[PDB]
């Protein structure tokens, strides 16, 4: 007899059906960052990667697999057939025409418009119940594309929106005050880009409202000039791409914090793109970031933040700008 | 006044003094993979990145800093100036030429010895009390070189060694036997290269020796062809490098593992690379990976792994090829 | 016009069903030590407690509940009626009339079968696809009982067995040798306690047999008295209980280790009790502890440990006494 | 010819100074819950236990030690001699004369001051540079006591205080809103106990002030009756004591978290007790809770919460009664 069977008495069969599968679509720098972080937070027991390049795909898979000793994720699978997606509770989409030196969240749409039409319909054919987390830019419109195509009630199609923008914000806030970002609370909402809006009313430490102590905080009259930390956040990715062509780690850490909420029913509040049709005016079927309540069904709840009239404005604007495009969708 | 002064009341002044600082030298794929693993296991309170590529170094530091929120390591620094290395408990060196497709690791010795002639002085100058962990290849030869240039006790100069080769061995073992690599045991000693030695003696699950249950284990007269699983771990690097152009994920977890045993002082046993003079009939200063005991002081104890005669010859000459290069080494 | 509706706008009318529920039956010391171990390892998104003394049951629930901020398990629930153990993937039994400051585990089986005939059917009534971790003492006969009552296939009625016994054996080894228990390997088997086999072979570090080194190990012939560590691994329950009046922390860490292997599908090996009918001279319907591949379907494979002369005796001697007791059981 | 010397060659002998040691004083329910939460977060390389009951100690130490296989804390030491507290970085005081189903957390201050006159001097002797955490109740007064008997500066004497008063307040805030305690923000400050202060303006989700939406909030005419959340918090302890006899689980999780911010230099914001003389109109040496900033030197910074002289009264009246008792302690 073979050595395996000389050493190991069998007892069953099936053992394949993964119970917490997670799938990354795209294995550029972002997808791998997502992957390496989903893998070290012990979120998924199966991890499936999909992309079109088949050398880069096999090799990345091989490399993580070689570390399984140092992990608690016991199956890692790759391939350009979406059949390995099969039964993923959550699917992360990062793939498509991404970025330049200089180009910003407004030089693709039509590129990525079309790529998506293969990816999405196949994520639904082997993961028909799954949850859809859109990362690749222009992320608010691509959540539109992802939603209609797959069908899916709006709660199960989440875009990653301003989740990282509020993080980079809470980092610059903490660096200014000497407090850990965990203890600085600040929200950045809207469409992820230059038309994000930092809601300064909610900026606080230990409960105390910074806007209250510093009434001119945010207005271009500000002594301390905080409106610029919101400009560091808009141009962080520009000044990190300028130093090394791309961003990766931070999105991966932010994304894995989102998957954490979903995969564990934390019902924490994150700012992510979902369908605000109704809220803040907005009568169109548009997507953009708002304090959501993420769980094993994704966006079950929204936190109806009270905006000022100029804030509610800049939202509707961007919320037009967008639908001025999506009425024109080839899909 | 200032906002930060309406809000926070200072009470203690002074201090940076790093209590558990780690320093990674080199921010290539390997480096940033260690830095990312080491950041996610909460091994450092300060983490420093040093390299010669200014903009890439800066940009990688920023990418990580933008993730502080999802981390628990409160300070991350970088620069060209080893001054930011100062007072480190552990210094992880990864800089230097890495293997092209097909290239051996010993073919990088001369190019890297030059780079160590620069790097080690500056490291010692700022953290003479540290432990040195060598990742760059050829890792056994560069561990030795780092010993001569540092003049650190042999126990504080550790080689990355065959910790990853044994870990790749245990992945392949486990996949043959449908077992998690944690529960498969078996050690790869020697050099981190083509003359590594697999030790079937100690191959076992649940304490059950595999060479007695199958007395043709390893050897060519092997119909199950187990000697090819050690051939797969030798050809591991080449094939990843073939596929994606470099390895990074597995070794960064392999390194953070070593780091875990040193920072927390576990006295775990790893096959790091150390000085073996006067053992297995070797009498010159050749560093080789034997199972060691790592902790707060680095290596402190060598497990004497009882080898065959072939296992002991394999090792001696994997050692004697190693000394060949090492003797003619000029610095 | 509530304030919650003024802040939250819902989308998800309905839903729940927990995807990683764990129930613990009995909130004595052991159970609550299980519960806290399970909780800080974030293995479950819903922890359910059930006992019959309800007051102590609700107080422990609140004590955990209040620590919600520090756990990643959003739903902790308990009660008297098992309708809240519903949808457990894993259920852990600590019930029964507990031993007292020094009672052996073979004077008790009578009353226990009859509580189990209330509990075990209620567990399946609400969580039909769950796995039965039996912790109650004595583990081997009581696992047989749980199995015989639920009608579950043997792969789903796991006994704590000699797991913590091997854990303690490994802690005693490493403290002898001066090594972390992780780098010391050893395997105690059989009926849990006294009739426990210390398989002196498996005793290895870095794979090199402690026996074939000093071949009077685990013998009366031993200068270094090593047959005694086994004796301490049997008299440990005693010496703790004799001092603090029950054992808790070590057992809950052990249960959380198996739980993790089951809930995270790790397929690691552990010395646990399941049916061993057909091996070593057992074709009774006994339960003993052997190395077992634990996965999402409980035991999946047995590790056919090659046992010696004297030891294969001790395994079945016990096994037929057990069968004595178990052939009479009135249920 | 020892089994050890044959299996291991030794390079270093000496050693010791553990880098992140933690001493817990008092192995009651609270102490042991502290010790177990600190062990399952890997904050310490060494944990010491000190107490008075010689046997009950060795049992708790030996139970944990048998769990060494499931922890990354290589050393656990117990003893009634505080020479085992040697070189701690954090020292957690849980010991004292506590209460029943009556005794108010304010009147016994003197019996405890007596006990602290034994502990504190021995603690500060063998760890002159430790951080001192007081959990024992009346935690605010006994913190002031520990401060005097040590001569330590303000920043290294810290009282447990309202840390769990706020954990519980936020957990209940999650009850009403269906949000994880992590995304519910609010502070309970003042004197630990019945006269703590719920800062209602603070209270927010996602940054939106619940006090601005629901202007009654925490008032008497408030139809949702948000006043009884505070009442629930203030009485929670005693209600849990009724049911199970004592509290434990939530404190240890409370203390683990504090211990992490200090041991990892987070600079996170916590409501711990510190010297408040000079703010809100207090001119006596009294400690009560405000949001301090916890680091590697303990308390480095205070948050000056905008109270409103009703709130600010409560604090004053708390200081005055506090200094009342503090003035009549013989020590």
DSSP B31-72: HHHHHHHHHHTT--SEEEEE-S-HHHHHHHHHHHHTTGGG-S
Compare CB distances from B8 to D72, D74, D303 and report the shortest one's residue.
D303
Catalytic residues of D: 192
Q: Does A267 sit within 8 Å of C12, measured CB to CB?
A: no
D181 at the C interface (CB within 8 A)?
yes
Binding site as annotated, residues of C for NAD(+): 28-56, 98, 137
Whole-number Å distance between alpha carbons of B58 and C314: 66
B42 at the D interface (CB within 8 A)?
yes
Whole-number Å distance between alpha carbons of D91 and D89: 7
B310 membership: H or E segment, kind and range: helix B310-327
Structure-token match 């002082």, residue found? B265
Task: Give D 72-131 residues with CB within 8 A of chain C.
Answer: 74
- B190 a known binding residue? no
- Angle, helices C227-234 vs C163-177, to 10°: value is 130
- Angle, helices C139-150 vs C109-126, to 10°: value is 40
Q: Which of C180, C217, C182 is nearest to C198 (CA)?
A: C217
Q: Does B302 sit within 8 Å of D8, measured CB to CB?
A: yes
Query: If you measure CA to CA, which chain C residue comes closest to B207?
Result: C202
Residue C299: list chain A partners with CB under 8 A: 11
Burial of C224 (0-12, 13-18, 19+ CB in 10 A): middle
- D267 a known binding residue? no
CATH, domain D162-329, list 3.90.110.10, 3.40.50.10490, 3.30.70.20, 3.40.50.150: 3.90.110.10
D56 at the C interface (CB within 8 A)?
yes
Q: Which two tokens stand for residue D7?
A: 């299996």
Whole-number Å distance between alpha carbons of B97 and D59: 55
- Angle, helices D139-150 vs D109-126, to 10°: value is 40
Q: Does B206 sit within 8 Å of C291, measured CB to CB?
A: yes
Chains in contact with chain A (at least 3 beta-carbon pairs closer than 8 A): B, C, D
Structure-token match 């000190």, residue found? D50
Measured distance between the N- and C-terminal CA atoms of chain B, rounded to whole angstroms: 59
Catalytic residues of A: 192
Residue C260: list chain B partners with CB under 8 A: none
Task: Give B 298-317 residues with CB within 8 A of chain C.
Answer: 301, 303-306
Question: In Å, how far are A268, B85, B205, C254, D69 from C257, measured between CA atoms?
Answer: 28, 38, 18, 5, 10
Q: Does B213 sit within 8 Å of A7, measured CB to CB?
A: yes
Q: Does B59 sit within 8 Å of A242, measured CB to CB?
A: yes
B135: DSSP letter? -
Ramachandran bin of D157, using left for φ above 0, alpha for ψ from -120 to 50, beta for the remaining angles? beta
D266 at the B interface (CB within 8 A)?
yes
D40 at the C interface (CB within 8 A)?
yes
Q: Which of C32, C24, C233 is nearest to C134 (CA)?
A: C24
Rounded to the nearest angstrom, the minimum Cα separation between B135 and chain C is 22
Contacts of C17 (CB under 8 A, 6+ apart): C87
Residue C22: list chain A partners with CB under 8 A: none
Query: If you measure CA to CA, which chain A residue comes closest to B179?
Result: A74
Q: Which of D187, D203, D206 to mutate to test the interface with A (most CBs of A within 10 A)?
A: D206
Q: Where are the beta strands (DSSP E) in chain A?
A: 8-10, 21-25, 46-50, 75-78, 88-93, 131-134, 157-159, 184-185, 188-190, 196-198, 204-205, 208-209, 268-275, 287-294, 301-303
Residue A268: list chain D partners with CB under 8 A: 179-180, 182-183
Rounded to the nearest angstrom, the minimum Cα separation between D292 and chain C is 18
Rounded to the nearest angstrom, the minimum Cα separation between B180 and chain C is 5
Contacts of B285 (CB under 8 A, 6+ apart): B144, B275, B277, B326
Q: Which of B102, B76, B100 is nearest to B24 (CA)?
A: B76
Compare CB distances from C181 to D40, D69, D248 and report the shortest one's residue.
D69
B201 at the C interface (CB within 8 A)?
yes
B7 membership: H or E segment, kind and range: helix B3-7
D42 at the C interface (CB within 8 A)?
no
Resolution in Å equals: 2.9
Q: Does B296 sit within 8 Å of D19, measured CB to CB?
A: yes
Whole-number Å distance between alpha carbons of B192 and B98: 14
- B11 a known binding residue? no
Torsion B263-A256-A189-A202 (CA) sign: negative
Q: Which of C283, C299, C282 is nearest to C291 (CA)?
A: C299
Q: Does C74 sit within 8 Å of D249, measured CB to CB?
A: no
Query: Which technique was used to obtain these atomic coordinates?
Result: X-ray
Residues in chain B: 331
What would you measure as the largest C-alpha separation in chain C, in angstroms?
A: 83
In sequence order, the β-bridge partners of residue D298 are D295
Burial track B227-257 (b if 16+ CB lie within 10 A, e otherwise):
eebbeebbebbbebbebbebbbbbbbbbbbb
Whole-number Å distance between alpha carbons of B134 and A324: 56
Measured distance between the N- and C-terminal CA atoms of chain A, rounded to whole angstroms: 57
Q: Does D19 sit within 8 Å of B301, measured CB to CB?
A: no
Q: How many helices (H) does chain B have, and how many strands (E)?
A: 11, 15
Task: Give D 225-254 residues with CB within 8 A of chain C.
Answer: 236, 239-245, 247-250, 252-254
C70 at the B interface (CB within 8 A)?
no
Q: Does D73 sit within 8 Å of B15, measured CB to CB?
A: no
- Output the CATH code of domain D14-161: 3.40.50.720
Catalytic residues of B: 192
Q: Which of C85, C89, C95, C193 is nearest to C146 (CA)?
A: C95
Q: Does B177 sit within 8 Å of A4, measured CB to CB?
A: yes
- B146 a known binding residue? no
Domain spans of chain D, in order of start: 14-161, 162-329
Contact D111, D141 (CB under 8 A): no
B296 at the C interface (CB within 8 A)?
no
Rg (C-alpha) for chain C, rounded Å, is: 21
Q: Which two tokens stand for residue C147?
A: 């199995």
Whole-number Å distance between alpha carbons of B45 and B73: 5
- D49 a known binding residue? yes
Q: Does A207 sit within 8 Å of D204, measured CB to CB?
A: yes
Residue C266: list chain B partners with CB under 8 A: 180, 182
Residue D306: list chain A partners with CB under 8 A: 208, 212-213
Compare CB distances from B56 to A64, A213, A244 and report the shortest one's residue.
A244
Rounded to the nearest angstrom, the minimum Cα separation between C301 and chain A is 5
B275 membership: H or E segment, kind and range: strand B273-275
What would you measure as the largest C-alpha separation in chain D, in angstroms?
A: 84
Question: In Å, how far are B234, C185, C288 from B209, measured between CA atoms?
Answer: 23, 12, 22
H-type helices in chain D, by residue range? 3-7, 29-39, 54-66, 109-126, 139-150, 163-177, 210-213, 227-244, 249-263, 310-326
Contacts of C201 (CB under 8 A, 6+ apart): B207, B208, B209, C209, C211, C306, C308
Phi, psi torsion values for C114, nearest 5 degrees: -95, -25
């Amino acid at each position: 007899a073979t050595l395996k069977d000389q050493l190991i008495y069998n007892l069953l069969k099936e053992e394949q059906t993964p119970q917490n599968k997670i799938t990354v679509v795209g294995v550029g720098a972002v997808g791998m960052a997502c992957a390496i972080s989903i893998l070290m937070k012990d979120l998924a027991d199966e991890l499936a990667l999909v992309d079109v390049i088949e050398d880069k795909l096999k090799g990345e898979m091989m490399d993580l697999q070689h570390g399984s000793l140092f992990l608690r994720t016991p199956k890692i699978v790759s391939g350009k057939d979406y059949n390995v997606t099969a039964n993923s509770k959550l699917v992360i989409i990062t793939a498509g025409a991404r970025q330049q030196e200089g180009e910003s969240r407004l030089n693709l749409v039509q590129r990525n418009v079309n790529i998506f039409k293969f990816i999405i319909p196949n994520v639904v054919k082997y993961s028909p119940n799954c949850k859809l987390l859109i990362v690749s830019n222009p992320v608010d419109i691509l959540t539109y594309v992802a939603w209609k195509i797959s069908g899916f009630p709006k709660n199960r199609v989440i875009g990653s929106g301003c989740n990282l923008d509020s993080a980079r914000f809470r980092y610059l806030m903490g660096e200014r005050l000497g407090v850990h970002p965990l203890s600085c609370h600040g929200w950045v909402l809207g469409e992820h880009g230059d038309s994000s809006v930092p809601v300064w009313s909610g900026m606080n430490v230990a409960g105390v409202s910074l806007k209250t102590l510093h009434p001119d905080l945010g207005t271009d009259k500000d002594k301390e000039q905080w409106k610029e930390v919101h400009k560091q956040v808009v141009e962080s990715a520009y000044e990190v791409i300028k130093l090394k062509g791309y961003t990766s780690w931070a999105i991966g850490l932010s994304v894995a914090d989102l998957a954490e909420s979903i995969m564990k029913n934390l019902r924490r509040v994150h700012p992510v793109s979902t369908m605000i049709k109704g809220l803040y005016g907005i009568k169109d079927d548009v997507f953009l970031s708002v304090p959501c309540i993420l769980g094993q069904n994704g966006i079950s709840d929204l936190v109806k933040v009270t905006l000022t009239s100029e804030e509610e404005a800049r939202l509707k604007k961007s919320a037009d700008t967008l639908w001025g495009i999506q009425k024109e969708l080839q899909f």
